[PDB]
Design a binder for these strands. Structure first.
Lengths: 102, 121, 124, 122
RNA sequence: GGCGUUGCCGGUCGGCAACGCC
RNA sequence: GGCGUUGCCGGUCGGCAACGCC
RNA sequence: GGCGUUGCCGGUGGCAACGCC
């Protein structure tokens, strides 16, 4: 039950997920290990599906050249707040590196 | 036909990013700039293929968005009201009312009383 | 008590004359001259009697001249209307730690009067 | 206004009273009060004439009270022998830039006398 | 995080920053 | 490197450090 | 006026809630 609600909370929120405090490790780590969630930073986690088409959006954007944080925010319709961590997470996992999709 | 097939994936991603607040027919007509029942030749083709799903006359939901909405609705259930469901997805009657009518028609959720119940099929 | 004790009175006075509007506290003075409280307390009281220092509060003594000058600055600031602690501080280029004790002292000798959170100069 | 000019004179004085032993230069005062040399020069002379300020050199004027106190500090410092410029700077807690002009001024009105690289209060 | 000391700020019993310690 | 402005230092016409320019 | 919390913004401070003083 608590694992289903945790999942929905992130799924419903999508590209603008709640922070650890807002939702407030035992459970989250489990979902991460189950492919349900993925850690972007110490702050908040993202639903993998949400992270999925969110990545698909970034990819379809960099098609027409580089792109800064501002541009990223527009396509995802989020805010520099949530878009900056996400984009940094992508530089990490090597999805990108303005920015370019490598 | 490059400037033709690129309009199909173009619309798909449009409904893809819109998720639970899908753009209406009338609305998408101007966003891409295309005739009335002419956009139909695009929407319906994607419809038959299954990429888009028609909930009502006004708008369609991308294949996935429906799946996920159905997942959140599956969690929400014993019984639930339209308000509880609207909060479950954090949406408005504008879209939720139509989606629930759809889910009734496809026998996903049945209206047992003034509330619906996700039929465990 | 000889003549080197007399130089001590001079070096003490100068400590206050130089420090001016940010006078050293009893503790700092004791430390600077390496004095026992009892010695310092009597030296200060002597300087007060001789009209060299004026006691603002148990912590701070002010050189009489420093005080007189601060009163002139405050008098001019008070010309345009009542004034708050912050303006007195800006006017003196000092800090709250040093200015509040001066203003409380001035209210006490009735040079100024605090009404609300402002003061007005009544004296000369 | 007249009372407006009167206030301006109180603010010039205050500027010198507050700054004491590190008085602002002519240039600095002009910029602060947004005055033209012509005006500042006459205002200062008024102040000197009024016994409020004392000209130390061409850049520096000192408040009369700040000068008297610096003299007192120098007197006690020289009580135990000739003193150098650096010793004067330490006793006053100032800097060479402000102290040397003061000492040259004091030699001038003969308060002190320089002999070699040291001074004595006459 | 907690405690303390100091400084500056805002009238005043707080806020900010050193530093000490747990 | 060169020139320059400023500040502190050393009696004074130089040392140190910002800063500006070349 | 001091300060703090939060949101948006511009890649790293600006505007604006709300709050304490």
């Amino acid at each position: 039950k608590l694992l289903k609600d945790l999942e929905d909370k992130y799924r419903v929120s999508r590209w603008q997920p709640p922070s650890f405090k807002e939702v407030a490790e035992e459970l989250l780590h489990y979902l991460v290990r189950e492919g349900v969630l993925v850690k972007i930073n110490d702050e908040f986690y993202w639903h993998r599906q949400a992270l999925g088409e969110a990545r698909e959006v970034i990819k379809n954007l960099a098609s027409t050249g580089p792109f800064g944080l501002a541009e990223a925010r527009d396509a995802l319709g989020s805010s520099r707040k949530y878009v900056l961590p996400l984009l940094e997470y992508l530089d990490q996992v090597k999805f990108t590196r303005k920015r370019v999709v490598v």
